[PDB]
């Protein structure tokens, strides 16, 4: 188990245009395109992120790339950001992967009213960060998925997963 095993199983894969969780126009193993209602600007979103003209349909190769790119964003994402990076540093391995799933799936701007539940996480308060967690409009819209995030927060462990 490690990252990219992790997020393939939370986002699945799909190799045309298709409409994310937020009904947002997405490709490949979660790779969001555009908030616009335009599937016009969504391909020229992804024929950009490709490097040809693709009209909406992408390669597994193509696919998995992408997803490394944007795993490897988000880290990096976290690293630059004055309030994750020492709460993310804080953390050991596993649930270093709860919290690029996170931000993965919501970006920082969406993570950014988790503050109580990052303090929470830093003091190694599982079980406390596991309830303050979910209590979040992301539990509430996507709370299989939150669940197993959680969990591995909460145990440091890849029991949800498996």
């Not at 997405?26 to 335009?38: D, E, R």
């Not at 996507?142 to 959680?150: E, F, G, L, S």
């Amino acid at each position: 188990m490690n990252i990219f095993e992790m997020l393939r199983i939370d986002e699945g894969l799909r190799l045309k245009i298709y409409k994310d969780t937020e009904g947002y126009y997405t490709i490949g193993i979660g790779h969001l395109l555009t908030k616009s209602p335009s599937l016009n600007a969504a391909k020229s979103e992804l024929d950009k992120a490709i490097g040809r003209n693709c009209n909406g349909v992408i390669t597994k190769d193509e696919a998995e790339k992408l997803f490394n790119q944007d795993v490897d964003a988000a880290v990096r994402g976290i690293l630059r950001n004055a309030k994750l990076k020492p709460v993310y540093d804080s953390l050991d391995a596993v649930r270093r992967c709860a919290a690029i799933n996170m931000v993965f799936q919501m970006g920082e701007t969406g993570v950014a009213g988790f503050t109580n539940s990052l303090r929470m996480l830093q003091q190694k308060r599982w079980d406390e960060a596991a309830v303050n967690l979910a209590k979040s409009r992301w539990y509430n819209q996507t709370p299989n998925r939150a669940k197993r995030v959680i969990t591995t927060f909460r145990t440091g462990t890849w029991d949800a997963y498996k």
